């Protein structure tokens with residue numbers, strides 16, 4: 032492995048994710064041979080938790096004293112909007128920084144020519160879903176600083192008992208991976224080298240954020256979630272009891288289940304009384320439950336009972352995680368389990384970093 | 391079979407559908423024994439095509455010279471909004487109308503006590519999905535006045551050739567039935583008496599109409615479709631080429647495919663330039679393609695290759711039908727076929743009418 036900072040980057044449709052390995056076993060002689068630009072990069076990344084106006088280091092996710100490529104170091108996790116990649120690349124071309132970059136996600140292709148404006152930088156494009164699988168399996172194998180990387184919600188159908196609990200993935204196959212980013216990819220993983228994309232859905236995190244922005248005027252993902260936490264989705268949705276006056280008993284649909292998402296918004300007087308918060312929550316519930324349903328159908332067809340949900344639609348989004356856990360547990364009568372991972376949307380970036388020794 | 395007009399009624403979450411059998415073999419003696427109220431009902435229904443301000447007789451769907459319950463007559467098809475059922479029931483209690491009513495849909499239960507305000511009326515509640523199956527199989531078996539009730543889109547992947555063609559369902563089993571009403575029910579039909587509800591989705595016609603109303607201010611389903619016919623959904627959706635700069639080749643996703651529905655609406659400048667017509671079309675495309683995807687997954691898991699789509703989401707909605715035909719044909723490489731039926735959303739009402747001899 033190369034004199035070069037060790038990065039892996041996943042350039043998605045909405046967010047760039049960057050994994051950075053900071054060596055902590057640097058010898059006295061190594062510090063001598065280190066050029067100023069390399070020292071400047073290391074100090075900038077490790078002494079700041081906000082980069083410019085939109086970059087964020089997720090300090091709580093840092094893996095400390097990881098051994099990687101024969102060196103000990105800390106693995107850092109950084110995100111910024113893809114819209115701001117021109118600023119990243121303009122920073123990279125700065126004279127104070129004159130690298131082998133393993134990059135994945137669609138932007139590895141879309142912005143290939145832009146990365147090559149950085150003199151002599153060597154860009155290696157790696158497949159988006161292969162990096163996801165490799166990074167997910169790697170992070171679970173090294174643990175989250177000794178704690179479990181994977182968790183589930185115990186007793187997900189009872190709120191008085193529902194609680195996050197660690198889950199052991201030491202024999203993780205087979206596994207359904209549901210990656211909720213701008214859109215959704217669903218993978219059936221049979222071994223480390225044997226997986227297929229079962230299907231996907233374009234109703235993903237970008238549908239939640241785009242519809243929420245149109246309907247409520249929210250200006251950020253976090254604001255959308257804050258609104259949804261205060262709302263009542265039943266003010267927008269038409270429920271089974273709104274159609275039947277009760278349960279649809281013959282087919283086991285309870286009266287409180289949604290029959291038609293946003294279905295009460297066909298009435299003008301209801302549109303005039305619904306709140307922005309109600310609409311935010313209805314958008315979240317609609318998108319989340321649709322993903323849960325698709326995930327359930329894929330698990331049944333693939334004969335897989337463990338479904339891991341990743342991607343940044345679920346970052347700081349406990350409501351959606353609990354909705355997913357409840358829906359899988361309820362519809363399957365306990366035979367399917369929703370699983371979640373602490374490192375959220377960073378697995379592609381880690382998987383890309385792991386491709387470095389091949390170059 | 392009873393002195394009573396022969397009706398079947400399906401009271402849905404949004405629309406009431408009514409089938410009415412008009413006898414055309416009435417003898418001279420039968421006209422004598424007919425009371426004025428029965429004559430008044432027959433004349434009102436057959437001499438008007440609009441009933442009050444919101445009732446419509448779909449004259450083009452009339453089955454002429456049908457033999458039913460040993461009598462020859464014409465089968466009529468009438469719809470009105472469930473919101474106006476109080477007007478129907480108040481009309482029914484009029485003194486000029488002083489019946490065995492077979493009723494299905496959720497409103498058969500929700501409005502049971504209201505129907506019983508009509509003196510001595512006998513209400514028989516029948517199951518919503520059983521009536522759908524029985525009515526669908528019946529109408530296809532009697533034909534559409536000698537023409538095929540069922541049709542498909544030939545060469546659905548090529549617009550220069552794509553065209554509606556009759557399809558023979560003379561041995562209709564097995565069959566996947568996708569009923570797109572306010573919400574969506576999906577049935578696997580193995581015989582006339584053996585079917586199961588495979589799943590459903592709450593993202594149905596009410597989601598299209600509710601979201602469209604919120605986003606565009608449209609005041610009717612027809613206005614929503616008119617707007618969507620003029621729009622460009624790619625102004626709201628984020629496409630694969632917006633993320634990759636091209637195809638995602640490894641997994642066969644073409645650049646023109648939607649990656650994130652409404653995903654370009656996360657950007658304020660794009661929200662400010664998108665048109666209402668664009669938003670209407672994006673809503674239609676998003677809802678329709680999600681149903682097509684769920685239908686495809688259910689067909690693969692049930693090992694069924696014929697998928698019939700019914701329900702009034704598809705009435706006067708050729709765009710959605712063609713989207714469904716293309717999506718099933720494309721994803722399945724021709725192994726799945728989307729089928730459509732001329733009688734749209736009336737099968738439950740017909741199935742209810744067919745239950746009359748049991749009472």
Ligand SMILES: Nc1ncnc2c1ncn2[C@@H]1O[C@H](COP(=O)(O)OP(=O)(O)NP(=O)(O)O)[C@@H](O)[C@H]1O
Pocket residue numbers: 042043044045046047136137211212213214215235236237238239240252342343344345346376633649
């Ligand atoms: N700070 C944020 N800004 C924007 N979106 C966020 C943010 N935090 C969470 N999200 C959500 O995270 C989603 C993006 O998840 P992510 O896994 O990073 O997708 P992506 O890789 O950029 N897209 P894709 O090309 O489809 O894989 C958005 O659609 C939002 O729902």
Ligand SMILES: Nc1ncnc2c1ncn2[C@@H]1O[C@H](COP(=O)(O)OP(=O)(O)NP(=O)(O)O)[C@@H](O)[C@H]1O
Pocket residue numbers: 274290401402403404405406495496570571572573574594595596597598599611701702703704705735
């Ligand atoms: N004139 C109309 N008025 C309202 N909706 C219409 C109209 N025409 C077509 N639609 C569409 O038809 C859908 C209703 O279809 P329909 O099959 O009659 O459902 P329903 O039986 O009333 N609902 P459900 O209880 O879920 O079965 C609406 O959601 C619209 O998308």
Ligand SMILES: CC(C)(CO)[C@@H](O)C(=O)NCCC(=O)O
Pocket residue numbers: 044137159212213214215216230231232233630633638643648649650
């Ligand atoms: C980046 C992609 C395109 C691939 O992971 C992602 O946005 C996705 O899977 N969208 C859904 C595409 C679909 O299956 O309809």
Ligand SMILES: CC(C)(CO)[C@@H](O)C(=O)NCCC(=O)O
Pocket residue numbers: 271274279284289290291403496518571572573574575589590591592
């Ligand atoms: C009238 C019902 C409830 C049943 O046909 C219909 O609206 C439906 O199937 N809605 C979808 C319910 C679901 O499967 O989530």
Ligand SMILES: [Mg+2]
Pocket residue numbers: 043044136212213379
């Ligand atoms: Mg991604």
Ligand SMILES: [Mg+2]
Pocket residue numbers: 402403495571572738
């Ligand atoms: Mg219905």
